[PDB]
Short mmCIF file of C-alpha atoms in Angstrom, two decimals:
data_model
loop_
_atom_site.label_atom_id
_atom_site.label_comp_id
_atom_site.label_asym_id
_atom_site.label_seq_id
_atom_site.Cartn_x
_atom_site.Cartn_y
_atom_site.Cartn_z
CA UNK D 596 -0.07 -0.34 -0.06
CA UNK D 597 1.43 3.31 -1.07
CA UNK D 598 -0.37 6.37 -0.21
CA UNK D 599 0.52 10.53 -2.44
CA UNK D 600 -0.46 13.95 -1.79
CA UNK D 601 -1.19 16.20 -4.46
CA UNK D 602 -2.27 19.03 -3.72
CA UNK D 603 -2.42 19.57 0.48
CA UNK D 604 -4.30 23.47 1.08
CA UNK D 605 -5.66 25.28 3.70
CA UNK D 606 -9.18 26.54 3.93
CA UNK D 607 -9.82 29.44 6.42
CA UNK D 608 -13.96 30.06 7.27
CA UNK D 609 -14.63 33.66 8.78
CA UNK D 610 -18.31 34.69 10.07
CA UNK D 611 -18.62 38.55 8.72
CA UNK D 612 -18.63 41.35 10.91
CA UNK D 613 -19.23 45.31 10.68
CA UNK D 614 -15.75 46.72 10.95
CA UNK D 615 -16.60 48.30 14.16
CA UNK D 616 -16.88 45.56 15.87
CA UNK D 617 -14.92 43.54 14.45
CA UNK D 618 -12.06 46.68 15.77
CA UNK D 619 -13.66 47.02 18.50
CA UNK D 620 -13.22 42.89 19.34
CA UNK D 621 -9.11 43.62 18.42
CA UNK D 622 -9.07 46.60 20.96
CA UNK D 623 -10.63 44.24 23.91
CA UNK D 624 -8.66 41.29 23.62
CA UNK D 625 -5.59 42.94 23.40
CA UNK D 626 -5.08 43.23 26.95
CA UNK D 627 -3.21 41.20 29.25
CA UNK D 628 -6.01 40.65 31.06
CA UNK D 629 -8.05 39.02 28.91
CA UNK D 630 -6.20 36.24 27.53
CA UNK D 631 -7.65 33.38 26.51
CA UNK D 632 -6.66 30.26 28.24
CA UNK D 633 -7.41 26.79 26.92
CA UNK D 634 -6.25 23.38 27.92
CA UNK D 635 -5.95 19.64 27.18
CA UNK D 636 -9.70 17.42 27.53
CA UNK D 637 -6.64 14.25 28.50
CA UNK D 638 -3.86 16.46 30.50
CA UNK D 639 -1.40 14.49 31.40
CA UNK D 640 1.47 13.05 31.34
CA UNK D 641 2.43 10.60 29.79
CA UNK D 642 5.04 6.95 31.11
CA UNK D 643 5.00 3.44 28.61
CA UNK D 644 7.03 1.61 30.62
CA UNK D 645 7.66 -2.36 28.88
CA UNK Z 844 -26.36 -37.58 34.41
CA UNK Z 845 -24.96 -33.15 35.05
CA UNK Z 846 -21.30 -33.43 36.20
CA UNK Z 847 -19.67 -32.25 38.54
CA UNK Z 848 -18.56 -28.72 38.03
CA UNK Z 849 -16.91 -25.87 39.19
CA UNK Z 850 -17.75 -22.05 38.40
CA UNK Z 851 -15.32 -19.75 36.48
CA UNK Z 852 -15.44 -16.21 36.75
CA UNK Z 853 -14.52 -12.55 34.84
CA UNK Z 854 -15.14 -9.86 33.81
CA UNK Z 855 -14.73 -7.15 30.36
CA UNK Z 856 -12.92 -3.83 29.94
CA UNK Z 857 -12.77 -2.44 26.87
CA UNK Z 858 -12.47 1.23 25.88
CA UNK Z 859 -11.99 1.60 29.99
CA UNK Z 860 -9.16 2.88 31.15
CA UNK Z 861 -8.60 2.47 35.19
CA UNK Z 862 -8.32 5.39 37.53
CA UNK Z 863 -7.56 5.82 40.37
CA UNK Z 864 -8.06 9.83 41.80
CA UNK Z 865 -5.96 12.08 43.76
CA UNK Z 866 -8.98 12.96 46.27
CA UNK Z 867 -9.46 12.11 49.61
CA UNK Z 868 -13.22 10.76 49.39
CA UNK Z 869 -11.94 9.88 45.66
CA UNK Z 870 -14.49 11.62 44.52
CA UNK Z 871 -14.30 14.75 41.75
CA UNK Z 872 -15.91 17.92 43.41
CA UNK Z 873 -13.62 20.22 41.55
CA UNK Z 874 -10.57 19.62 38.97
CA UNK Z 875 -8.42 20.45 41.57
CA UNK Z 876 -8.57 17.89 44.39
CA UNK Z 877 -8.34 18.55 47.87
CA UNK Z 878 -4.55 16.93 48.11
CA UNK Z 879 -3.38 18.78 45.50
CA UNK Z 880 -3.77 21.44 47.46
CA UNK Z 881 -2.37 19.73 50.16
CA UNK Z 882 0.71 20.07 48.72
CA UNK Z 883 0.63 23.92 49.01
CA UNK Z 884 -1.04 23.11 52.46
CA UNK Z 885 2.34 21.49 52.72
CA UNK Z 886 4.41 22.55 49.53
CA UNK Z 887 7.68 19.61 49.71
CA UNK Z 888 8.46 16.34 47.27
CA UNK Z 889 8.62 13.78 48.11
CA UNK Z 890 8.76 9.60 45.67
CA UNK Z 891 5.96 7.69 44.89
CA UNK Z 892 6.35 4.43 44.27
CA UNK Z 893 3.73 1.86 42.39
CA UNK X 1 15.53 33.40 77.08
CA UNK X 2 18.19 34.58 74.45
CA UNK X 3 19.41 31.44 72.66
CA UNK X 4 22.37 32.68 70.99
CA UNK X 5 21.74 35.56 68.22
CA UNK X 6 20.41 32.71 65.53
CA UNK X 7 21.04 32.15 61.31
CA UNK X 8 18.07 34.15 59.50
CA UNK X 9 14.65 31.64 58.91
CA UNK X 10 14.57 32.05 55.12
CA UNK X 11 11.29 30.82 54.05
CA UNK X 12 10.63 29.22 50.75
CA UNK X 13 8.39 29.74 47.22
CA UNK X 14 5.39 28.53 46.33
CA UNK X 15 3.18 28.36 42.71
CA UNK X 16 1.03 29.92 45.29
CA UNK X 17 -2.10 28.80 47.48
CA UNK X 18 -1.22 32.34 49.57
CA UNK X 19 1.43 30.42 51.46
CA UNK X 20 4.81 30.68 51.80
CA UNK X 21 5.95 27.13 51.66
CA UNK X 22 7.31 27.46 55.07
CA UNK X 23 10.81 28.59 55.74
CA UNK X 24 13.75 26.75 56.51
CA UNK X 25 17.30 27.62 59.19
CA UNK X 26 20.45 29.28 56.86
CA UNK X 27 22.79 26.33 56.26
CA UNK X 28 24.49 28.89 53.40
CA UNK X 29 25.95 30.52 55.85
CA UNK X 30 28.65 30.31 58.74
CA UNK X 31 29.06 32.07 61.77
CA UNK X 32 28.35 28.62 63.84
CA UNK X 33 30.64 26.11 63.36
CA UNK X 34 34.43 26.16 64.28
CA UNK X 35 38.17 26.72 63.54
CA UNK X 36 39.60 30.07 63.71
CA UNK X 37 40.84 31.99 67.21
CA UNK X 38 38.90 33.32 70.13
CA UNK X 39 39.82 36.81 68.86
CA UNK X 40 37.75 35.93 66.55
CA UNK X 41 34.29 36.58 68.74
CA UNK X 42 34.28 39.99 67.97
CA UNK X 43 34.65 39.66 64.13
CA UNK X 44 33.05 37.38 63.23
CA UNK X 45 29.78 37.21 65.77
CA UNK X 46 29.78 40.80 65.41
CA UNK X 47 29.96 40.34 61.71
CA UNK X 48 26.68 38.36 62.08
CA UNK X 49 24.94 41.28 64.30
CA UNK X 50 25.92 42.95 61.29
CA UNK X 51 23.47 40.70 59.08
CA UNK X 52 20.17 40.50 61.88
CA UNK X 53 20.57 44.08 62.35
CA UNK X 54 20.08 44.89 58.40
CA UNK X 55 17.24 42.41 58.20
CA UNK X 56 15.37 43.88 61.36
CA UNK X 57 15.58 47.10 59.33
CA UNK X 58 14.82 45.59 56.18
CA UNK X 59 11.30 44.55 56.71
CA UNK X 60 10.42 47.32 58.62
CA UNK X 61 10.69 49.40 55.49
CA UNK X 62 9.45 46.81 52.70
CA UNK X 63 6.92 44.59 54.88
CA UNK X 64 2.70 45.58 55.36
CA UNK X 65 1.73 45.05 59.04
CA UNK X 66 -0.21 41.65 59.20
CA UNK X 67 -1.12 39.53 62.55
CA UNK X 68 -0.05 35.90 60.82
CA UNK X 69 3.27 35.56 59.22
CA UNK X 70 1.41 33.67 56.45
CA UNK X 71 -1.77 35.39 55.71
CA UNK X 72 -3.45 32.53 52.76
CA UNK X 73 -4.36 34.91 51.06
CA UNK X 74 -3.66 38.54 50.48
CA UNK X 75 -6.61 41.56 50.34
CA UNK X 76 -7.17 42.77 46.91
CA UNK X 77 -5.82 46.27 48.04
CA UNK X 78 -2.61 44.48 49.10
CA UNK X 79 -2.25 42.29 46.28
CA UNK X 80 -0.52 45.44 44.35
CA UNK X 81 -2.23 45.67 41.37
CA UNK X 82 -0.04 45.50 37.95
CA UNK X 83 -3.40 45.94 35.33
CA UNK X 84 -3.47 47.94 32.87
CA UNK X 85 -4.64 51.30 31.98
CA UNK X 86 -6.94 52.79 29.70
CA UNK X 87 -6.73 52.82 25.28
CA UNK X 88 -8.50 54.25 22.43
CA UNK X 89 -9.96 52.76 19.56
CA UNK X 90 -10.87 55.25 16.12
CA UNK X 91 -13.59 52.80 14.88
CA UNK X 92 -13.25 52.93 10.56
CA UNK X 93 -16.53 52.90 9.66
CA UNK X 94 -20.18 54.70 9.27
CA UNK X 95 -22.85 52.00 8.87
CA UNK X 96 -25.64 54.69 9.74
CA UNK X 97 -24.66 57.06 7.13
CA UNK X 98 -22.28 54.99 4.79
CA UNK X 99 -25.31 52.55 4.16
CA UNK X 100 -27.88 54.60 2.54
CA UNK X 101 -25.00 54.54 -0.50
CA UNK X 102 -24.92 50.64 -0.29
CA UNK X 103 -29.24 51.02 -1.24
CA UNK X 104 -28.39 53.50 -3.65
CA UNK X 105 -26.57 51.00 -5.73
CA UNK X 106 -22.91 51.97 -4.37
CA UNK X 107 -20.00 48.34 -4.10
CA UNK X 108 -18.24 49.15 -1.84
CA UNK X 109 -14.22 47.52 -2.31
CA UNK X 162 -13.33 58.31 3.58
CA UNK X 163 -15.07 59.61 0.64
CA UNK X 164 -18.86 60.70 2.60
CA UNK X 165 -18.89 63.14 5.65
CA UNK X 166 -16.11 63.46 7.93
CA UNK X 167 -18.10 61.31 10.69
CA UNK X 168 -15.06 59.72 12.81
CA UNK X 169 -16.11 58.13 16.02
CA UNK X 170 -13.62 57.44 19.99
CA UNK X 171 -14.45 54.16 21.45
CA UNK X 172 -12.57 54.79 25.39
CA UNK X 173 -11.67 51.00 26.86
CA UNK X 174 -10.93 49.93 30.86
CA UNK X 175 -9.82 46.41 32.42
CA UNK X 176 -10.72 44.34 35.31
CA UNK X 177 -11.68 43.69 38.78
CA UNK X 178 -9.32 43.70 41.61
CA UNK X 179 -7.87 39.83 42.44
CA UNK X 180 -7.15 38.44 45.97
CA UNK X 181 -5.17 35.04 46.20
CA UNK X 182 -0.97 34.88 46.20
CA UNK X 183 1.11 37.73 46.36
CA UNK X 184 2.89 38.00 43.37
CA UNK X 185 7.45 36.88 43.10
CA UNK X 186 8.37 40.82 42.57
CA UNK X 187 6.37 41.64 46.12
CA UNK X 188 7.43 37.69 47.68
CA UNK X 189 10.82 39.07 48.22
CA UNK X 190 9.44 42.41 49.99
CA UNK X 191 7.04 40.53 51.68
CA UNK X 192 9.20 38.08 53.46
CA UNK X 193 12.15 39.24 54.45
CA UNK X 194 14.50 36.84 56.64
CA UNK X 195 13.17 36.57 60.25
CA UNK X 196 15.23 36.63 63.28
CA UNK X 197 13.51 34.79 65.85
CA UNK X 198 15.47 35.54 69.34
CA UNK X 199 14.83 33.61 71.74
CA UNK X 200 13.69 30.44 70.42
CA UNK X 201 10.98 28.66 71.55
CA UNK X 202 10.69 30.11 74.65
CA UNK X 203 7.55 30.94 76.13
CA UNK X 204 3.56 29.08 75.61
CA UNK X 205 3.17 27.16 72.15
CA UNK X 206 0.63 29.55 70.09
CA UNK X 207 3.67 31.99 70.26
CA UNK X 208 5.74 29.84 69.16
CA UNK X 209 5.88 30.21 64.63
CA UNK X 210 4.02 27.10 63.42
CA UNK X 211 4.08 28.96 59.74
CA UNK X 212 8.61 27.84 59.44
CA UNK X 213 6.89 23.97 59.45
CA UNK X 214 5.97 23.49 55.61
CA UNK X 215 3.66 21.25 56.62
CA UNK X 216 1.06 23.23 58.41
CA UNK X 217 -2.29 24.98 58.03
CA UNK X 218 -3.37 27.77 60.19
CA UNK X 219 -6.60 27.67 58.88
CA UNK X 220 -7.34 24.64 61.06
CA UNK X 221 -4.04 24.83 62.80
CA UNK X 222 -3.48 21.29 62.31
CA UNK X 223 -0.15 20.05 60.70
CA UNK X 224 -1.17 17.41 58.06
CA UNK X 225 1.00 15.56 55.05
CA UNK X 226 -0.53 12.58 54.21
CA UNK X 227 2.60 10.77 55.75
CA UNK W 1 -40.57 58.75 7.62
CA UNK W 2 -39.78 55.15 6.14
CA UNK W 3 -40.43 53.74 9.95
CA UNK W 4 -43.63 55.25 10.83
CA UNK W 5 -45.03 54.38 7.91
CA UNK W 6 -43.71 50.68 7.85
CA UNK W 7 -44.36 48.65 11.00
CA UNK W 8 -47.55 49.69 13.05
CA UNK W 9 -48.75 47.32 10.12
CA UNK W 10 -46.63 44.90 11.73
CA UNK W 11 -47.46 45.31 15.57
CA UNK W 12 -50.30 45.23 14.96
CA UNK W 13 -49.96 41.45 14.93
CA UNK W 14 -47.38 40.31 16.53
CA UNK W 15 -44.27 40.28 13.62
CA UNK W 16 -42.52 42.99 15.37
CA UNK W 17 -43.79 43.96 18.35
CA UNK W 18 -43.47 43.27 21.92
CA UNK W 19 -43.67 39.95 23.53
CA UNK W 20 -47.33 38.31 24.45
CA UNK W 21 -46.29 38.74 28.73
CA UNK W 22 -45.69 42.42 28.03
CA UNK W 23 -49.19 42.91 25.04
CA UNK W 24 -51.41 41.11 27.07
CA UNK W 25 -53.92 42.38 29.97
CA UNK W 26 -51.67 41.09 32.91
CA UNK W 27 -55.00 39.72 34.50
CA UNK W 28 -54.63 37.65 31.83
CA UNK W 29 -50.60 36.32 31.51
CA UNK W 30 -51.39 36.07 35.68
CA UNK W 31 -53.89 33.45 34.93
CA UNK W 32 -51.36 31.96 32.21
CA UNK W 33 -49.12 31.47 34.35
CA UNK W 34 -51.31 30.37 37.69
CA UNK W 35 -53.03 27.35 35.03
CA UNK W 36 -49.98 26.62 32.92
CA UNK W 37 -49.99 22.92 34.40
CA UNK W 38 -52.94 21.52 33.54
CA UNK W 39 -54.91 24.16 30.60
CA UNK W 40 -51.90 26.06 29.15
CA UNK W 41 -52.69 29.02 26.91
CA UNK W 42 -48.89 29.90 25.54
CA UNK W 43 -49.54 28.57 22.21
CA UNK W 44 -52.72 30.98 22.02
CA UNK W 45 -50.34 33.89 21.92
CA UNK W 46 -47.78 34.30 18.98
CA UNK W 47 -44.08 36.77 20.11
CA UNK W 48 -42.22 38.41 17.54
CA UNK W 49 -38.87 37.73 17.17
CA UNK W 50 -36.37 40.13 15.47
CA UNK W 51 -32.85 40.02 14.54
CA UNK W 52 -30.85 42.00 15.38
CA UNK W 53 -30.35 45.22 12.28
CA UNK W 54 -27.23 46.61 12.84
CA UNK W 55 -23.64 45.79 14.53
CA UNK W 56 -22.93 42.66 13.07
CA UNK W 57 -23.71 43.48 8.78
CA UNK W 58 -20.88 42.64 6.95
CA UNK W 59 -20.75 46.15 5.92
CA UNK W 60 -18.18 46.64 3.00
CA UNK W 61 -18.91 42.82 2.54
CA UNK W 62 -15.33 41.00 1.36
CA UNK W 63 -15.03 37.16 0.84
CA UNK W 64 -17.12 34.14 3.75
CA UNK W 65 -13.71 31.26 2.71
CA UNK W 66 -10.31 31.21 1.75
CA UNK W 67 -7.82 29.05 0.54
CA UNK W 68 -3.94 29.70 0.91
CA UNK W 69 -1.84 28.22 -1.92
CA UNK W 70 0.37 26.46 -3.78
CA UNK W 71 4.29 26.67 -4.35
CA UNK W 72 7.68 24.79 -3.28
CA UNK W 73 8.98 23.22 0.74
CA UNK W 74 12.11 21.38 0.72
CA UNK W 75 11.97 17.10 0.30
CA UNK W 76 11.58 14.48 2.56
CA UNK W 77 11.36 10.95 2.53
CA UNK W 78 8.59 10.19 4.67
CA UNK W 79 6.57 13.24 5.56
CA UNK W 80 5.29 15.64 3.45
CA UNK W 81 6.12 18.97 4.85
CA UNK W 82 3.68 22.53 3.86
CA UNK W 83 3.79 26.33 4.28
CA UNK W 84 1.51 29.33 4.25
CA UNK W 85 2.38 32.22 5.09
CA UNK W 86 -1.84 33.62 5.43
CA UNK W 87 -3.04 36.66 3.25
CA UNK W 88 -4.62 39.41 4.94
CA UNK W 89 -6.74 42.34 4.24
CA UNK W 90 -9.34 44.25 7.10
CA UNK W 91 -11.20 44.26 10.23
CA UNK W 92 -11.63 40.42 10.66
CA UNK W 93 -10.90 37.73 12.97
CA UNK W 94 -9.98 33.96 12.33
CA UNK W 95 -11.43 31.35 14.20
CA UNK W 96 -8.97 28.72 14.23
CA UNK W 97 -11.84 25.85 14.56
CA UNK W 98 -12.95 26.83 11.50
CA UNK W 99 -9.52 25.81 9.48
CA UNK W 100 -9.12 22.89 8.32
CA UNK K 3 -36.06 28.33 10.08
CA UNK K 4 -39.64 27.50 10.09
CA UNK K 5 -41.33 29.30 12.91
CA UNK K 6 -42.36 28.65 15.87
CA UNK K 7 -42.52 31.72 18.47
CA UNK K 8 -45.24 32.26 21.76
CA UNK K 9 -46.42 33.09 24.96
CA UNK K 10 -45.38 31.24 28.54
CA UNK K 11 -41.22 31.97 27.99
CA UNK K 12 -40.78 30.84 32.20
CA UNK K 13 -41.71 29.18 34.84
CA UNK K 14 -45.78 29.93 35.69
CA UNK K 15 -45.33 30.94 38.97
CA UNK K 16 -47.64 28.74 41.92
CA UNK K 17 -46.59 28.15 45.53
CA UNK K 18 -45.29 24.40 45.04
CA UNK K 19 -46.91 23.28 48.06
CA UNK K 20 -49.84 24.41 46.11
CA UNK K 21 -50.90 24.88 42.16
CA UNK K 22 -52.36 28.52 42.20
CA UNK K 23 -51.76 31.89 42.25
CA UNK K 24 -55.35 34.08 41.42
CA UNK K 25 -57.40 35.10 38.20
CA UNK K 26 -56.01 37.80 39.06
CA UNK K 27 -58.08 40.68 41.42
CA UNK K 28 -61.14 43.41 40.78
CA UNK F 3 -34.63 20.62 24.93
CA UNK F 4 -36.96 19.92 22.34
CA UNK F 5 -36.63 23.63 20.63
CA UNK F 6 -36.12 23.51 16.96
CA UNK F 7 -35.52 27.19 16.56
CA UNK F 8 -32.82 29.86 17.79
CA UNK F 9 -33.74 32.62 20.49
CA UNK F 10 -33.12 36.61 18.59
CA UNK F 11 -31.14 38.11 21.09
CA UNK F 12 -33.29 41.53 20.17
CA UNK F 13 -30.10 43.87 20.68
CA UNK F 14 -27.26 44.56 18.63
CA UNK F 15 -23.55 43.92 18.87
CA UNK F 16 -21.65 46.64 21.79
CA UNK F 17 -24.55 48.42 23.98
CA UNK F 18 -20.51 51.25 25.05
CA UNK F 19 -21.05 53.94 22.89
CA UNK F 20 -17.38 56.08 21.83
CA UNK F 21 -18.05 60.22 20.61
CA UNK F 22 -17.84 61.82 17.00
CA UNK F 23 -14.13 62.81 17.12
#
């Protein structure tokens, strides 16, 4: 079995919104008290032992 | 004409990972467990052997 | 009462529930070992006198009054606020006087009237928690206990024990 | 001008007015609440439901979707190395859950 | 989508030891 | 839930307003 790639292409979808609504949001999330934060669903140190 | 017999017993668990919490009750009453803050009740280093 | 002029107690650090992870004697210093001469009794314990004196002065200047070595939670006033200040957005569009233009058949991809809007904005609410790392240094200048373990228990520092909890007054380490 | 010319027609009915808790007489709202569990009225009266008309509008109007492009890479035997430098224009916020 | 939207948006109050209130007052 | 119809919020984005320059 063998796999080829021809075309590895990137797609993005944008929410259309007013450019005053958009620019308000940018200023809000350029403050470091409005820093976004994320965490793994399984947040774990993973160790395999024979 | 049934023959003498011995019982065999087992279980099968598939798609589960066994879990031992690090709580005093073994119950999750918050993500940050109550013995996760017992090393901020303390704050020392210990060795773990399993 | 007085048992020596003792070494200071160095507080440890931790990822902050509001504890300082106890304290312990300084053993990265001499002044209590042996081998020199008897003329260094006021040349090596004058040093140790000087270190302690600088500590009492230093602690008094830089540390807020407290009823506890480790309060387990500093008030919102006393965490030291490093949160941002106000800022202004120049909003780029009319959407109430350049939209009747697009209803009037104009496609778009500053030529209409000079309406430009400025918007102000602020920053977060006070936080209470553990003290910062810049302000840990100023709140936890090393302490000199001058009459070690003298008097009744209940005036002993139990906040130099890195296993003690002062909001249950018990020492539990699960060992 | 335009707004009083057309809109009292629509709030005669209830496709642009206020919700039923506000246009019904207060005694009927009180009775409908009291009796709800065995003799519903919360069906016989329509609530208007009106989309926001401003501050969400596309405005100038620009693309809903982008695709990012082919050029060259450094070769590898068992891995395929792809790079993008993204496109930029004006005043939009990308969500990375909607990239693939 | 295909439209429905109607009265009774929340719980109909009744002091739950019982199942009533009144018809209003007059 | 047993709903097949969105709400509208019934209000546009941003309550808070800025001065003309």
